[PDB]
Amino acid sequence: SNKKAYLEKVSRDGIISALAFDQRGALKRMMASHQKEEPTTEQIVSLKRLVSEELTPYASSILLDPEYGLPAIEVKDQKAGLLLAYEKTGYDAKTSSRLPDCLEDWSVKGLKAAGADAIRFLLYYDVDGNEAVNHQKKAYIERIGSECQAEDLPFFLEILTYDEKISDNSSIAFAKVKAHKVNEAMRVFSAKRFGIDVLKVEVPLNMAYVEGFTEGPILYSKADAALAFKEQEAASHLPYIYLSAGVSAQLFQETLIFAAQSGATFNGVLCGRATWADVVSVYIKEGEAAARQWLRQEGVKNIESLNDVLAKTASPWTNKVL
Amino acid sequence: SNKKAYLEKVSRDGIISALAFDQRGALKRMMASHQKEEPTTEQIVSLKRLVSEELTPYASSILLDPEYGLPAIEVKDQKAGLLLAYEKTGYDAKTSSRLPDCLEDWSVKGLKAAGADAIRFLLYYDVDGNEAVNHQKKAYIERIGSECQAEDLPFFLEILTYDEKISDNSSIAFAKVKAHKVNEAMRVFSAKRFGIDVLKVEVPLNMAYVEGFTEGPILYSKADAALAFKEQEAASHLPYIYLSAGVSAQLFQETLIFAAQSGATFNGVLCGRATWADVVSVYIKEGEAAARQWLRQEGVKNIESLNDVLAKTASPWTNKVL
């Protein structure tokens, strides 16, 4: 009922131009690289509060995590929608099952009360894997989907693909099956039983092996690459958006341009490190005030450039909901 | 909202006179005591099929578990409703948190598809316990309450009380605080936030310590016992029913009579071991046919006696549902 009202609060002109900063494990790895000590709860909380304060005026919404991001919510722009992450971070590298789990302290009710306009759950999925594992996963998504129809909140399912016998996603071996993995997963979770409103997905290819985007060996010509984007768009009726996957800002913007040229009708992005990655080093080495002025200068032009590109490549989701 | 339609499907004349055989761990312990080998899946399934076959004509519904009870479903009486258990059996006895967990292969959607008219979740709760633990538990119940409001199925919450510093629920020390534990838990989960339709609860006392009912030490006069039942009735606006807690058939019936005399407005029972406990020994030691005739004689007389008692002591839930 009010799913479109909430969806409108995280969009702008029917396009989701959202800033992602839910990173937890990844954030303390970035921080640890620039200092001798372990990253403190203070540091994580303060940085998130800082990024929220300074960049949310230029985003339609922000994605945050309940673990460190609750103080960030109150300093956020009044025009920005709010997405909250629901899942526990990471996965056990000693098995290939990578089962999903919700934060112990939370429910969609609780997340809604904290100010969420939409819920994000991150799922690792292998369409070709053990289907006892996949049975349990689908059952879990069913549970959360039901929660979101009861609480009347849009459900963002983020799908990160992998292969149970390939450890390295950046490998050539994985790049040869990624399109299949991504597209078929979208096709699976388009089923109404899961109650998903928006899919958050990666681009169907490894752009580092696409003609023109690499300066070395290629797996795909530009024609075959466009086919992958076409197959991805035919794979679902649901609105979908792209994650940046930690690429450079420039690579990301060119990928969106290529995708639009290929026929992809993506409905926005949830972009993180490609926008703000460099602020981490500045914050840790030169302090909070310096970090603030980096965000007021190079941060704003990162996100403005992204918005500039999005304005010419992204398609409104209004066309995909009657 | 067909929640009341479903609730009617498990009732008879606004009274829930239901047969419970969801027991799993408890069942194999009962079976193990009577034979050298550990009880195998065939035996459990066959016994569930047998009890379901013979006793469901005298009950308004049956509670079963998805692990072993699905074959029992096709053989249950067709004027009898179906409840399915959602939670994993047992708890880790080496910690006091006793955290709740759903069966991984299932969702409320799936239980509905399997034929459920209602969903049962069993929760261990200590109102005086660690309240980080209790926060997590309440969050979990919120989730399932939401699931059930989406699938439009009645939510039965069974609450078993315990004390984090008392291992034995049948001890005198626990009997001294049991009324408080049960009644306050009922108040807690009466909140609209949890979405519960019917409470499955214990009697607020240990009857083996009540004046008139015991052959040993007395903890409660009959006046204090009646006060506990009155306090239980004021603790919730919701319909509630009693589990038998494995007492003898005659004691359970005497407890129900006392309860009604005290002013309790319980709306039926979900009775298991007090009805059919003795059949386990018969089934294991003298075979299936012998078990069949126990159920046809002493089993039928147990459950018919119970129905007789219920018709003069239990109150219709229609009075609590506007």
XYZ file of C-alpha atoms in Angstrom, chain A residues 22-312:
291
model
C 26.906 0.097 5.591
C 30.409 -1.328 5.354
C 31.613 -2.954 8.556
C 34.324 -5.568 8.077
C 35.491 -3.714 4.955
C 35.645 -0.360 6.765
C 37.916 -1.543 9.576
C 40.198 -3.155 6.988
C 40.481 0.187 5.207
C 41.099 1.969 8.517
C 43.583 -0.597 9.859
C 45.808 -0.076 6.807
C 46.480 3.554 7.810
C 47.290 3.150 11.522
C 49.086 0.929 14.059
C 46.060 0.388 16.304
C 42.728 -1.374 15.884
C 39.892 0.872 14.652
C 37.709 2.077 17.528
C 33.933 2.197 17.849
C 34.422 5.968 18.200
C 36.236 6.223 14.896
C 33.707 4.199 12.910
C 30.732 5.991 14.420
C 32.277 9.447 13.972
C 33.261 8.843 10.355
C 29.798 7.583 9.450
C 28.280 10.611 11.200
C 30.608 12.827 9.198
C 29.888 11.272 5.779
C 26.156 11.380 6.506
C 26.332 15.041 7.526
C 28.219 16.204 4.455
C 27.156 14.040 1.497
C 23.475 13.271 2.134
C 22.374 16.660 0.799
C 23.468 15.313 -2.598
C 21.884 11.857 -2.355
C 18.271 10.668 -2.540
C 18.892 8.278 0.345
C 21.577 6.662 2.480
C 22.145 3.018 3.388
C 23.324 2.456 6.958
C 23.863 -0.450 9.363
C 22.252 -0.670 12.843
C 25.582 -1.678 14.411
C 27.413 1.640 13.938
C 25.090 3.754 11.829
C 22.299 4.734 14.223
C 24.038 7.954 15.366
C 24.494 8.832 11.665
C 20.717 8.713 11.054
C 19.963 11.850 13.119
C 22.531 14.098 11.368
C 21.358 13.092 7.899
C 19.618 15.475 5.432
C 15.843 15.775 5.771
C 15.482 15.106 2.053
C 17.329 11.804 2.138
C 15.531 8.511 2.543
C 16.918 5.812 4.814
C 17.782 2.175 4.108
C 18.962 -0.168 6.856
C 20.918 -3.394 6.560
C 19.341 -6.409 8.222
C 21.962 -9.138 7.831
C 25.069 -10.022 9.814
C 28.298 -9.075 8.064
C 30.494 -11.596 6.246
C 30.530 -15.366 5.847
C 32.493 -18.420 6.990
C 35.338 -18.974 4.510
C 35.733 -22.567 5.745
C 32.492 -23.638 4.035
C 30.848 -22.812 0.704
C 27.281 -22.650 1.995
C 27.459 -19.018 3.165
C 24.112 -19.139 4.956
C 22.288 -15.846 5.704
C 21.503 -14.510 9.193
C 19.615 -11.488 10.539
C 20.999 -9.253 13.286
C 19.986 -10.806 16.578
C 18.660 -7.577 18.093
C 16.463 -6.569 15.187
C 13.260 -7.143 13.298
C 11.687 -5.239 10.414
C 9.337 -3.754 13.037
C 12.340 -2.543 15.019
C 14.101 -1.265 11.923
C 10.986 0.594 10.829
C 10.786 2.235 14.269
C 14.419 3.380 14.025
C 13.501 5.367 10.915
C 13.984 2.953 8.009
C 12.097 3.650 4.775
C 13.230 0.334 3.297
C 15.039 -2.836 4.286
C 18.156 -4.281 2.718
C 19.203 -7.901 3.055
C 22.436 -9.158 1.539
C 22.447 -12.733 0.277
C 25.293 -14.756 -1.211
C 23.873 -17.005 -3.926
C 25.112 -19.775 -6.211
C 22.361 -20.871 -8.610
C 24.323 -24.044 -9.432
C 25.190 -25.004 -5.858
C 23.818 -27.574 -3.424
C 20.045 -27.147 -3.544
C 19.573 -28.196 0.034
C 21.565 -25.058 0.841
C 19.526 -23.049 -1.671
C 16.298 -24.448 -0.213
C 17.175 -23.007 3.202
C 18.190 -19.663 1.684
C 14.935 -19.289 -0.252
C 13.020 -20.191 2.907
C 14.881 -17.392 4.726
C 14.134 -14.795 2.036
C 10.491 -15.906 2.172
C 10.497 -15.141 5.900
C 11.887 -11.639 5.444
C 9.663 -10.877 2.466
C 6.623 -11.716 4.579
C 7.896 -9.443 7.359
C 8.167 -6.577 4.849
C 4.619 -7.011 3.488
C 3.309 -6.979 7.061
C 5.365 -3.903 7.986
C 4.549 -2.386 4.602
C 8.180 -1.552 3.748
C 10.016 -1.954 0.417
C 12.333 -4.958 0.374
C 15.761 -4.557 -1.244
C 17.437 -7.899 -1.904
C 21.128 -7.570 -2.619
C 22.484 -10.594 -4.441
C 26.199 -11.260 -4.453
C 27.052 -14.213 -6.663
C 29.786 -16.809 -6.146
C 30.766 -20.359 -7.125
C 31.121 -23.046 -4.453
C 34.355 -24.294 -6.088
C 35.870 -20.917 -6.964
C 37.349 -18.906 -4.094
C 38.465 -15.873 -6.121
C 35.691 -13.812 -7.747
C 38.173 -11.663 -9.667
C 39.578 -14.736 -11.409
C 39.204 -15.530 -15.108
C 37.415 -18.766 -14.259
C 34.717 -16.849 -12.414
C 34.481 -14.147 -15.061
C 33.404 -16.827 -17.569
C 30.288 -17.766 -15.596
C 29.413 -14.504 -13.837
C 26.755 -13.455 -16.336
C 25.019 -16.793 -15.865
C 25.255 -16.533 -12.068
C 23.902 -12.976 -11.871
C 21.123 -13.230 -14.448
C 19.812 -16.608 -13.306
C 19.752 -15.480 -9.667
C 17.662 -12.446 -10.615
C 15.339 -14.731 -12.530
C 14.970 -16.988 -9.469
C 14.173 -14.182 -7.025
C 11.693 -12.527 -9.378
C 9.156 -15.115 -8.148
C 6.341 -13.485 -6.197
C 6.760 -15.778 -3.144
C 9.861 -13.818 -2.099
C 8.081 -10.449 -1.916
C 11.038 -8.458 -3.241
C 10.436 -4.878 -4.407
C 13.914 -3.963 -5.705
C 16.926 -6.098 -6.616
C 20.386 -4.801 -5.791
C 22.825 -6.507 -8.154
C 26.308 -6.323 -9.662
C 26.910 -5.707 -13.361
C 26.715 -9.085 -15.132
C 30.358 -8.970 -16.266
C 33.889 -8.384 -15.111
C 34.545 -5.092 -16.920
C 38.299 -5.654 -16.551
C 37.952 -8.326 -19.253
C 35.730 -6.313 -21.598
C 37.072 -4.820 -24.859
C 37.853 -1.138 -24.375
C 37.771 -1.190 -20.566
C 40.979 -3.179 -20.216
C 44.355 -2.644 -21.853
C 45.177 -6.357 -21.688
C 43.417 -9.679 -22.389
C 39.678 -9.680 -23.100
C 37.031 -12.368 -22.542
C 34.178 -10.402 -24.125
C 33.905 -8.156 -27.153
C 31.689 -5.088 -26.765
C 28.921 -6.874 -28.667
C 28.877 -9.901 -26.341
C 29.067 -7.594 -23.335
C 25.972 -5.718 -24.518
C 24.192 -9.071 -24.838
C 24.911 -9.766 -21.158
C 23.298 -6.455 -20.184
C 20.325 -7.258 -22.428
C 19.966 -10.709 -20.848
C 20.157 -9.147 -17.393
C 17.346 -6.697 -18.220
C 15.136 -9.481 -19.556
C 15.892 -11.531 -16.456
C 13.437 -9.657 -14.223
C 10.321 -7.499 -14.147
C 11.458 -5.904 -10.883
C 13.336 -2.598 -10.567
C 17.074 -3.112 -10.084
C 20.099 -0.977 -9.214
C 23.889 -1.378 -9.405
C 26.440 -1.650 -6.623
C 29.860 -0.141 -7.379
C 31.840 -3.145 -6.064
C 34.728 -0.899 -4.956
C 35.857 0.112 -8.448
C 37.287 3.566 -9.190
C 34.766 6.403 -9.561
C 35.682 6.836 -13.233
C 35.385 3.142 -14.137
C 31.963 3.037 -12.515
C 30.650 6.051 -14.448
C 31.872 4.626 -17.769
C 30.280 1.269 -16.952
C 26.915 2.952 -16.379
C 27.284 4.741 -19.708
C 28.104 1.466 -21.448
C 25.215 -0.306 -19.715
C 22.706 2.337 -20.830
C 24.069 2.135 -24.392
C 23.666 -1.655 -24.305
C 19.978 -1.424 -23.408
C 20.025 -1.843 -19.633
C 17.199 -0.075 -17.817
C 18.762 0.057 -14.353
C 16.853 2.303 -11.974
C 19.724 3.895 -10.066
C 22.686 2.865 -7.913
C 23.770 2.302 -4.344
C 27.307 3.629 -4.554
C 29.880 3.606 -1.765
C 33.682 3.502 -1.902
C 33.798 4.809 -5.468
C 32.481 8.057 -3.947
C 34.118 8.315 -0.502
C 37.020 5.787 -0.323
C 39.777 8.417 -0.090
C 38.261 10.100 2.978
C 39.328 7.196 5.188
C 43.057 7.881 4.883
C 42.446 11.631 5.325
C 40.333 11.064 8.452
C 42.852 8.769 10.128
C 46.089 10.553 9.214
C 45.044 14.215 9.233
C 42.059 14.185 11.589
C 38.353 14.990 11.586
C 38.471 18.623 10.433
C 40.650 17.763 7.438
C 38.347 14.882 6.565
C 35.421 17.287 6.700
C 36.965 19.623 4.159
C 37.908 16.759 1.860
C 34.224 15.788 1.835
C 33.182 19.389 1.189
C 35.455 19.475 -1.880
C 36.415 16.170 -3.559
C 33.587 14.254 -1.947
C 30.877 16.536 -3.279
C 32.293 16.524 -6.806
C 32.531 12.715 -6.761
C 28.856 12.409 -5.925
C 27.862 15.329 -8.188
C 29.614 13.692 -11.133
C 27.782 10.467 -10.357
C 24.464 12.328 -10.299
C 25.399 13.976 -13.584
C 25.928 10.558 -15.187
C 22.860 9.006 -13.530
C 20.732 11.807 -14.942
C 21.576 10.620 -18.462
